[PDB]
């Protein structure tokens, strides 16, 4: 039936009130609060990066002749042939010859066994998708309303219709490239694949977890075996991934501005503090009451026996009043200064209501509509 | 009833430091010290077998090494894993070993053989483990913040992960050749044995019986004893077998690693008073704990410290509203009265 | 099923001709066998039945 549109700020945990007004029909007025504001950017995979694994095979001690190295097409293969090598074990000399000794050394880099549980995840970060939980006092109980904030998603709750966005601010903590470790995410601009530096993040680049095929440029320089031992001695630049572990600072949970929440799987922000929202909600004609058939409002008075100015409800307002018939009627504030905790009472004839509010000022003077009739409020609080 | 270590056997690699910094080839020479586990559990790979006898049978209470030319048993109570301190070890299977260790720059690992003789292996290794959460505790709790943390499991059983196995290079020994009664005479004491000699006639071979070379010198020959029947680890630290080609096997390893929870203690709530756009926390921590804050505004300013013993914290709350985080806990919210 | 090579022949992987006990009997073709089948897929079933023993 009747579209009632409102705006609220992007904060989550406040209650705000809003005044439903058809003409013709009597007032009603509806408590709304965000429970939760998920922000879900759609990610597309680059690769992942791990600990690297320096393979080094038994190294070939040619006695008595000269080892010749072959080009093998492995990740950072690297082969030397060493000359005038006299190894020494258990029992002695291994080679007969005193002269003409080679020692060929071989090392190549691959994924570690690791891999598969410890790993980091470079993303594509791109347009994310707003969600919205909003729970709303509708009909004397709380109902929960799960729907898209791009206002294009209609979500219908008790026959109302809820209409959530489009977001006013469509900032997101995340960048186009974003960096994922278990329970972190970090805002970073990660090279691309093949071209990872070594000693760095990517130093070791695989497109999936489970890829046979790896890149690697870890500066793997083999190095001649010390006198009469049988060794592979080599330099090589730390590990990436290990590096990167300890030098990744703060995630994105403590860092992102808006008191920003960060999530996994899948990567979102929750509860980012920035802009307004606006709610669309279509309240069916059976739920409205026509002035003819509603309960009427007369001789009306109100009394402040008790008020403390606080964020909560500190203050407690009677409201005496002489109804022409039984019937439910909302109680709203017609001042932006102070806020009423109960959004609808139980009106029966000549008895009286108590409400409780909330207000910042010394001198409260503020006037409340009980269905259709207003009443004047004086209050001093403390 | 399957023993892959019918098959493999312990062995002798070289090692920088067996004591007092003096290389050696070592029977219980360290292979690789894996340190992927967020948990701080070490995965370290030996050259000596844990858990097994020299018979093959599996005995947790017993270790066999290579003593010499063949292995030898020794006691699992005698084998010691230390950085810059005793380790705590919480597994052994074959060649691997699970250890809990403190800070340190190396890493020794020995045991104790049938005569005495403290045999031990000293490698450069820098072991400073990240803290798991955001406090520095000593002992692990029952209760707790249940946080994902990665190990080795404790489970005897190999699958996913393995090891490059090959047959054992010729191993040199001079005790094989003597003197009869100026010429030279090699004992094969039935095993194959490869001899070279600075000689005429016969010096070649690979020979399974007895073999005599008439005019030469022993210092002119050269002898070795050749395996083929068993399997070892693919060691750098051991040279590749000079007949065969690129033959190579492969073997299951115990101790893979993968996710698991850590429990981490949440440390108690601190005395709160507050003021004029300031909030007043008194701290009591029990041991290091982290102590985070941010604006909830366009500028965050992220700000953090460890906090050790007891310190009154004045923190500014500002309009838009201030998080803290206390160590494990639950980001405490703060905002200003209207 | 799944096959593996000895030297020009062919056979099921779990199933070796040397059964029972392939590495008592004879050890030093058991391993040679073994480095020949690193490659084949069925490779851990060759090594399950080739060092079980007692019939
Ligand atoms: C350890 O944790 C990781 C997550 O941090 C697990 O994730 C994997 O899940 C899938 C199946 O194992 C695969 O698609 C990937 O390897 C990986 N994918 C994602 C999205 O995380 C992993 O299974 C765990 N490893 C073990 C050994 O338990
Ligand atoms: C549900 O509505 C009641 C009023 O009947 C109110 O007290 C309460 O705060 C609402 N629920 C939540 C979770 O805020």
Redesign the interface.
């Given at each position: 039936g009747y579209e009632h549109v409102t705006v609220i700020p992007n904060t989550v945990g406040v209650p705000y009130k809003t005044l439903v007004n058809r003409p013709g029909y009597s007032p009603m007025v509806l408590e709304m609060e965000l429970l939760s504001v998920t922000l879900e950017p759609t990610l597309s995979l680059d690769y992942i990066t791990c600990?690297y694994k320096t393979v080094?095979?038994?190294?070939?001690?040619?006695?008595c002749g000269t080892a010749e190295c072959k080009d093998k097409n492995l990740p950072d293969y690297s082969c030397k042939v060493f000359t005038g090598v006299y190894?020494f074990?258990?029992?002695?000399?291994?080679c007969?010859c005193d002269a003409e000794n080679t020692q060929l050394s071989e090392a190549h880099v691959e994924k570690?066994?690791?891999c598969?549980?410890?790993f980091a995840s470079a993303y594509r970060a791109h347009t994310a998708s707003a969600s919205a939980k909003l729970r709303v006092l509708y009909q004397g109980n709380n109902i929960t309303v799960t729907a898209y904030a791009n206002g294009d998603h209609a979500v219908t709750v008790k026959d109302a219709k809820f209409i959530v966005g489009p977001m006013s601010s469509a900032w997101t903590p995340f960048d186009n490239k974003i960096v994922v470790y278990?329970?972190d995410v970090y805002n970073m601009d990660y090279p691309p694949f093949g071209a990872g530096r070594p000693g760095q993040f990517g130093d070791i680049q695989s497109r999936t977890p489970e890829s046979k095929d790896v890149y690697a440029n870890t500066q793997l320089v083999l190095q001649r075996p010390?006198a009469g031992?049988?060794?592979?001695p080599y330099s090589q630049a730390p590990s990436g991934f290990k590096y990167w572990?300890?030098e990744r600072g703060?995630s994105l949970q403590?860092?992102?501005?808006?008191?920003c929440q960060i999530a996994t799987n899948p990567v979102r922000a929750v509860n980012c503090?920035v802009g307004n929202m606006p709610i669309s909600i279509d309240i069916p004609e059976a739920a409205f009451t026509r002035v003819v058939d509603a309960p009427s409002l007369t001789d009306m008075s109100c009394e402040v026996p008790a008020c403390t100015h606080?964020?909560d409800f500190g203050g407690v307002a009677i409201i005496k009043y002489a109804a022409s018939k039984k019937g439910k009627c909302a109680v709203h504030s017609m001042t932006n200064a102070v806020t009423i905790r109960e959004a609808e009472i139980e009106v029966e004839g000549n008895s009286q209501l108590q409400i409780s509010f909330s207000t910042?000022l010394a001198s409260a003077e503020f006037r409340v509509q009980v269905c259709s009739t207003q009443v004047h409020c004086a209050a001093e609080c403390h | 009833n399957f023993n892959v270590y019918k098959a493999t056997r312990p062995y002798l690699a070289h090692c920088p430091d067996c004591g007092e910094g003096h290389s050696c080839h070592s029977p219980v020479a360290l292979e690789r010290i894996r340190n992927e586990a967020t948990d701080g559990t070490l995965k370290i790979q030996v050259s000596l077998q844990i858990g097994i006898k020299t018979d093959d049978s599996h005995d947790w209470t017993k270790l066999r090494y290579m003593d010499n030319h063949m292995p030898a048993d020794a006691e699992r109570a005698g084998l010691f894993v230390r950085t810059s301190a005793p380790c705590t070890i919480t597994g052994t299977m074959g060649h691997f070993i699970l250890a809990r260790c403190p800070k340190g720059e190396t890493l020794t690992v020995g045991f104790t053989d049938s005569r005495k003789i403290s045999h031990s292996c000293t490698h450069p290794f820098h072991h400073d483990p990240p803290v798991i959460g955001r406090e520095k505790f000593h002992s692990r709790p029952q209760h707790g913040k249940e946080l994902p943390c990665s190990t080795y499991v404790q489970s005897t059983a190999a699958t996913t992960e393995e090891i490059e196995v090959h047959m054992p290079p010729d191993t040199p020994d001079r005790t094989l050749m003597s003197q009869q009664s100026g010429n030279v005479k090699i004992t094969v004491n039935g095993q194959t044995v490869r001899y070279k000699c600075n000689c005429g006639g016969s010096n070649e071979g690979l020979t399974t019986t007895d073999k005599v070379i008439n005019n030469c010198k022993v210092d002119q020959c050269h002898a070795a004893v050749t395996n083929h029947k068993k399997w070892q680890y693919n060691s750098p630290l051991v040279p590749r077998n000079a007949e065969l080609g690129d033959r190579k096997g492969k073997i299951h390893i115990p101790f893979p690693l993968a996710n698991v929870t850590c429990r981490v203690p949440k440390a108690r709530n601190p005395t709160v008073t507050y003021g004029k756009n300031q909030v007043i926390m008194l701290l009591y921590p029990d041991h290091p704990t982290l102590l985070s804050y941010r604006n909830m505004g366009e500028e965050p300013n992220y700000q953090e410290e460890w906090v050790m013993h007891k310190k009154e914290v004045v923190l500014t709350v500002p309009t838009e509203g201030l998080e803290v985080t206390w160590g494990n806990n639950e980001p405490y919210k703060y905002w200003p009265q209207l | 099923p799944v096959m593996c090579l000895l030297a020009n022949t062919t056979f099921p992987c779990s199933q070796p001709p040397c059964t029972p006990c392939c590495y008592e009997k004879e050890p030093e073709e058991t391993l040679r066998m073994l480095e020949d089948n690193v490659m084949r897929p069925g490779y851990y079933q060759l090594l399950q039945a080739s060092l079980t023993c007692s019939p």
């Open positions: 600990e080094i095979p038994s190294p070939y001690v040619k006695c190894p074990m258990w029992g002695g000399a291994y007969f570690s066994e690791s598969k549980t410890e278990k329970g010390a031992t049988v060794h592979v572990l300890k703060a403590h860092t992102a501005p808006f008191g503090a606080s964020s910042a | - | -």
